Amino acid sequence: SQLEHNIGLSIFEPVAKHRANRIVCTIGPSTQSVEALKNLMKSGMSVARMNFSHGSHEYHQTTINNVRAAAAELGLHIGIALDTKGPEIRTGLFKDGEVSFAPGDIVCVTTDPAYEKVGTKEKFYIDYPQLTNAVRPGGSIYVDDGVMTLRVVSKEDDRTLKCHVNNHHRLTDRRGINLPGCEVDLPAVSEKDRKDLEFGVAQGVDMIFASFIRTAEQVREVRAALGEKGKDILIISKIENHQGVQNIDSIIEASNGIMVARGDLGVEIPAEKVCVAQMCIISKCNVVGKPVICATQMLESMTSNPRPTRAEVSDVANAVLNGADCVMLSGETAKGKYPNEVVQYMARICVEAQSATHDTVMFNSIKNLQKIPMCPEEAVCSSAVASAFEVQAKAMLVLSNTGRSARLISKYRPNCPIICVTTRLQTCRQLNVTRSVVSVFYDAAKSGEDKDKEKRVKLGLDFAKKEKYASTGDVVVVVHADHSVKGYPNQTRLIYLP
Amino acid sequence: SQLEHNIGLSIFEPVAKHRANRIVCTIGPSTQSVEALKNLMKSGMSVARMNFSHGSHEYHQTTINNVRAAAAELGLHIGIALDTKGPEIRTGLFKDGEVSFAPGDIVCVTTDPAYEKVGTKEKFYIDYPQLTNAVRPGGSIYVDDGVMTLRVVSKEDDRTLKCHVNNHHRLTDRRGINLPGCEVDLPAVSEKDRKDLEFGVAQGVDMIFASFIRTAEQVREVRAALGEKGKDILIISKIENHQGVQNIDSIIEASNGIMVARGDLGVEIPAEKVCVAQMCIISKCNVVGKPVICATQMLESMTSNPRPTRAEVSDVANAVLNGADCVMLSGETAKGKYPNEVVQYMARICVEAQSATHDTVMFNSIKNLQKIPMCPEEAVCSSAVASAFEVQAKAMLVLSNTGRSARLISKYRPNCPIICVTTRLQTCRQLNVTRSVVSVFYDAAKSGEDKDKEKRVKLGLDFAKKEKYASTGDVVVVVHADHSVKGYPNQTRLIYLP
Amino acid sequence: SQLEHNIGLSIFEPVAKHRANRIVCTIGPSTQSVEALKNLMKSGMSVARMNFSHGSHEYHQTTINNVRAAAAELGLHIGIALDTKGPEIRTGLFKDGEVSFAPGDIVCVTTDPAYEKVGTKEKFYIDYPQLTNAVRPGGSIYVDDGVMTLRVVSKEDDRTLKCHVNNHHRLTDRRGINLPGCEVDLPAVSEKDRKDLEFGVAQGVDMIFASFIRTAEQVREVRAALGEKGKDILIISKIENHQGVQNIDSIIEASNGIMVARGDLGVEIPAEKVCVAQMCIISKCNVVGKPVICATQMLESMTSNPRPTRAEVSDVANAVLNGADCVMLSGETAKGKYPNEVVQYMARICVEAQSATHDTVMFNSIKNLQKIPMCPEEAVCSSAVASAFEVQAKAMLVLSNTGRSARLISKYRPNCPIICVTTRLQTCRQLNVTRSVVSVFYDAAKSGEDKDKEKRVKLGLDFAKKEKYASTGDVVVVVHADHSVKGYPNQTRLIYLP
Amino acid sequence: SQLEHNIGLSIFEPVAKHRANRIVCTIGPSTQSVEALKNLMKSGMSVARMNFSHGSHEYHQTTINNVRAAAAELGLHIGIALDTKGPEIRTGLFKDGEVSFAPGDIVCVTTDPAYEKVGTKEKFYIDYPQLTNAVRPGGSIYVDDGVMTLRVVSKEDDRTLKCHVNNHHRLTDRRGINLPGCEVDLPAVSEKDRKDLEFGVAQGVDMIFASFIRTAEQVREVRAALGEKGKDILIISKIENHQGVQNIDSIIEASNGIMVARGDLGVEIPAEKVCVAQMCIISKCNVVGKPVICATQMLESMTSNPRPTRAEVSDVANAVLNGADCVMLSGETAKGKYPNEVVQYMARICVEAQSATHDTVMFNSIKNLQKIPMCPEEAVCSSAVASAFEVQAKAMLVLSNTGRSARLISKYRPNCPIICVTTRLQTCRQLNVTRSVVSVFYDAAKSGEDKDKEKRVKLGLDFAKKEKYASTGDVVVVVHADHSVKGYPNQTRLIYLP
């Protein structure tokens, strides 16, 4: 039981030597230089996130180039994520660049772009032209991470609502608007998004973080926008509104993975319900073996402070205990004063939660929910994890070309590293969002076809030794095909490191 | 399984109507007025915490009086907790009252009191005579809530360590000192703590939150200092260092309850290990049926902001899921700008977490770890909870004078309220730290002795109706003694509300 | 797990001192005298079965009187069961009283009663007039516990079938015929059965063993035949054909209990399938808490031998492990040479299987299948058994007037005796088919109404002491109503024997 | 749960097509001819048992020759078992060669060989020199398979006990003696056993059923007597008294397998305790993966009758449910009138019991008791069974030369056949005592060395098809080594049948 497992926990034992969970860092001014990126990577970054809510194509191109240069110097394969703007709504600019409101201030909000630059305490612009169809008198507009709310008093006309300010708040340029409980019908892929996505394909990004996904159909729109050359790019759908939560099953089935995007989510639904959504969404991803990211304000105070709060540490640990493959940093690394240190904390907290995890519970819980009969590769991958537990294997080794088999092993939550020997660099980069996996590139064009698997297995076992996963005489669980079968692994071996 | 339970969560269904968990609020200039306290109570405060690290007796007298006045106005019974300053290690003074250190600076620390008032960059005093025994070369000394770290290079004489400064820091007079992982031999109660406890006893406080408890023996010294007249006051031991974690079993045995005092703990042990200690301590308290409080920075950012961060919401939810009876607010209510709103959020989060709890799992886990044969009252109390689940009881009712039986029922974590009819006002106030319990005072001096239980049961059942726990025709599970057994409850009945 | 429980079993530990399972003995020439009955009772008989397939009303009246006289001398309350003939089919008599057949002998079987007395190797009578409608050419007739089978070659006419003898067998007067897989449409209550049943009511039998029950509707026919004065007589339906197995759910729901009547069953369906039917039927009875009897050839060889076979001992033990309340003897006691000794073996084997039983497994398995919410008396009775386990109670004590509450406790399979204080002698006698129960008669007409339960509880606790179930200072779990509630028990107490 | 599994049983659905359990038949005048043996084999005999308690070497030579001739005709590999007479305690002779005792008769028993040939009612010899040490006053001596009981009243001198006769009995010369609950210090092998073992080794028997095994040391003496040339012959220890039950762990460790020899056991310990010993011993054998045989009177009445009793059917079914690999027939096939029909019934019962088994429960129970870390071959074998369940495999295929790997797979109780391709005819014959296994001989002298496994795997897969275990497109789970590992299997593959 969890209770019995808990009472046996010790703060005095060694922690796991190899961190299983993965860290996604958002790049910005704190962290864009090749040197800053190197330090992020050394610190524990596996995936660099570009937030296309801001910055030009040239800015992000600098990010892309600097990431690749940093990773090449270190000999790492780092994933690159493009995080779409999507159907964001914002205020315009203000006179002087801030204005201040008191509870009871009457204020007009207007869709008329004439006011975009010159917002004031009594009138300012919101960049959503259908505003007055979307929110009626009596409705509420949420401003600036939902910190300030306006009750709509009346509709002055098709361009303008008169609003009552409900609480005190200071407002600066271009803050976020949310309209929970309104008919908001913006595309999942705007014209801006489409060009962004095309740019991502041209530049070979590994994955898309698709903002505000509401439906399976929207996932398919993102896939269509990525077009012929973007077919192998992962789509990680971000769940950040009511409807995305409602439609979680079909959204998961359509996507390659999920981000619990807790920032918008906690404004779109009551903040206290995010803790339940998170648990639900993460576990649904674990059951089907698709990567899941927990995001937003995880170590927030370390944007300014050299140490996190007690709540922030527990948040990171519990996202790991919940089942999340990855945990994410936004402003902490994009613009914070302690980018390296915040990644380093996050890494240490991950390893602690990982060592606190009751090792076979996830394996059994996930196994028990799978439909029988399995396909053979799933029976192989799950039974290979069971073998690993049985012999206390210090590593597993899998050949995977698309990544599918590495993800299938990771689905069953082994307690040791999964060394994946892959023939694709992109697979190395994409498997960064998958718990436990460490990728090694085998260049088939250069080294030969390796039909009998022996070159790739050697590469994997030498890597296991060199990187101090295991030594001579240690048993390793090795998964791939026999000499005939093509398309999936049908074989497991147990092998002593030579 | 937890996994299966997670995937079936219904995020948008109605939540539990009655909050089971309990909220401790620290009182301060934000919250001390009778009007503020009433609002705090309406918002969901069950226990008022007085932090005797600051403020004079006269200050706390006002808190005591105002709490009682506010509670009486609302017809509530509010616990009053005295949280001791506790013993401390501090540096001496410095020349000019400050010195600045840079990484790599070499500084001596001495326990020779001659240096107490003339600390320099070269040498300064720490008022712990056993220093040179407690930390060896290579050990660490923490200064100023762990913000500066010293590595001990060598022992220079029996009173002096040469140290290496690890990071930039400016020291002022008498900063706090921590010796991480180090045995520390301070008395349980300082001379100030004695005057503070004497004050708490004379003013009738309900419980002591005893600071820096390292051993069971110290708990007994606190108990001894409270004396005959304080014998009924709860001691809630605050676990703040590795010794307390290590000795948790015997500390729990000696105490009435535990606080996981995470702020100080995460200074003494690595921050990431606080999550392990927390899970362990809460579960160990659950197993023996003693109240446990989770504390420190749970909703910190609401000190200044009207909404909490995402990490803060998950911290509160998880402390509940961990099994904590109570959660606590410090600066958030003592000095924050949104005291009512922070308690209200805290209430709403507790309720979500409670509604997501897999109802019978805790009951079964707890029951399965109890030694058989049990005492009769514990068989009665656990089986009564079992019965409650079996009939979907909307409430339980227990007669308890000391509070014992009420805590013994709450030990088994029913999913409905536990109405406790008690003959002691102090019992009403003390049961505020115990999950699920709601107390009704029976005035035996006024209404008579009630040998046959009927008046107390009627009072409890009327309360269930009046307070909308249950209605006519609902089954209530009712626990007390038969006509002849004294000293404990030997009887459970299932009763339909008339 | 069963496996782990098994490997911990010991032949060297003391056995349970109080036998929980009950023994049904069939009365006949070996056992009909008052003195033989006394010895049966001393030996372990709880229920005397009268087999109305044979003997006149006067013969069974002698059984009834002798049972009551024997039980009165011993101060026991022994149940009396009437086991109906029902739709039995038999051969007639033969010339000389036996005939012998060889494989390939052609033989005519006739419904013509002219041949009833004078059967021969070539022609004999069967007492089922619709024979030639029921079995066609190609069908098989099973004779003498299915030991000999005849293939029907042709229908000579409406009264006569020509048959091929399939195997060697000797035939004596009035052997049984079975026709599995034929349309046999005899009543469940023949004219003979009706008079038998009426006789049973006139003579106050406690229960009916209703032969060949196929449907719920047939159970209702037996109930109707028992009429106004027979309403409180138990109907135990005997399952002994295919259709009875098929309809097990509705048959259980209509009956008071079930006998797995393995003799006819193992001829009506393939013998090897009886082991699966038995497991299924017994467990279905356990789940709804209705008494179930395992019958037929359990200690068969002890009809002639002073000791049983290894198979017979394991059969008795495993019927107990399967969950059966009772085990039954037929010819072993009706006509065997070792009636007392065979009952004594059966008793010892019961106690051994009882001590081998993993004590709380049945409790949990049965509990986990009950619909929630329960009615209050079921939550009381189940939670009272859980209390008993928790304190290692040596006895439980329940007040029951109809027996319902004693059966409800027994449903949850406590490991100690259930002392039932009852106001009805018939309840004492009927509860003999219920595992664990020991009944004590409280004569309310003589001793008073006992509204506060105190006389009956005293009677029960004195009985517990006198019969060496428990001593002064032992905790006993006592179930009945509080001072108000009528119709069911709503209360449980734990009480130390004074 | 078992209960829930029982209630869902479908009595009339199709049973398993392939019998997993194995049947040992004792050969005798009913069954010794080549024609009888072929029929026995067709009826389902897998092992022929020669009981060396009776018959000359020449008699058993005929059995050996005839078994081999019958097996060769049918293309079968039939195990041959030699069941030793074993050491014994017997009385001496009597004057006139018989004496009769009545209950209450007082008789001396002496170990003074002077009295060996002149036993009377007053005094007679027992040939066990340690008698007066082994049983004290109040202890029991059993005579003539436990049919007469003596209570020891007193020790008269160091060679003589005065005894009280408990029951009527007529003694003839040299009856068997048992000392129940008594340590007995006889050699493992008698002088006759030596000549018998020497004969078994010279004639190439596959296994010894070693009688009256009390200690591990005795197993080693049997092993020593078999010598270098008998080193590959299985020793199946027969557990026949309390010492054997007590020392079961170390006896199992020393043996290749166990027989629960219930006839002799139920003479030495109370008959009702045989069911406890049986459950314990079978489960202990299951846990270490060694073959266990249940023996004695399983279908006794079919010695004379063409159908079994109800108890006999449940005995066979329950031995299977208990976990026994094999069940055994003695007099039923040695000298009974229906040898073919008894084996056929036994087969049909085994199949019902197998079809009612809750498929994965044994697997999980067995796996959960294994020490971690396992050896690699045991992880491979258990995980291969896991895989089989996961894909609903219709067969497994294993390469095993010693039989080890085959037994190791059968340890985990798959629900399909285990096809074992072996290079040894003796391995085919020996694997007859192991549940599920079906052996195919690969002739390496004839077809070559098959380093890369392909010929043996093809042979096994062809067998699966030919023998209708599986078809084209069915997944088979295949266990052997990779190209380089020697001595054990380190590899599992899932293969579709071509």
Ligand SMILES: O=C(O)CCC(=O)C(=O)O
């Ligand atoms: O906002 C972030 O920091 C990235 C994830 C996101 O879009 C959200 O949490 O709303």
Ligand SMILES: O=C(O)CCC(=O)C(=O)O
């Ligand atoms: O810091 C607080 O809020 C009070 C609890 C305590 O002493 C601690 O967390 O260290």
Ligand SMILES: O=C(O)CCC(=O)C(=O)O
């Ligand atoms: O036949 C008996 O011995 C009584 C139960 C019965 O009717 C049967 O087993 O067929």
Ligand SMILES: O=C(O)CCC(=O)C(=O)O
């Ligand atoms: O008795 C048999 O059938 C052979 C097994 C044995 O020796 C026994 O059961 O005592």
Ligand SMILES: [K+]
């Ligand atoms: K974005």
Ligand SMILES: [K+]
């Ligand atoms: K304090």
Ligand SMILES: [K+]
């Ligand atoms: K009958």
Ligand SMILES: [K+]
């Ligand atoms: K023998």
Ligand SMILES: [Mg+2]
């Ligand atoms: Mg967002």
Ligand SMILES: [Mg+2]
């Ligand atoms: Mg503190």
Ligand SMILES: [Mg+2]
């Ligand atoms: Mg019958």
Ligand SMILES: [Mg+2]
């Ligand atoms: Mg024997």
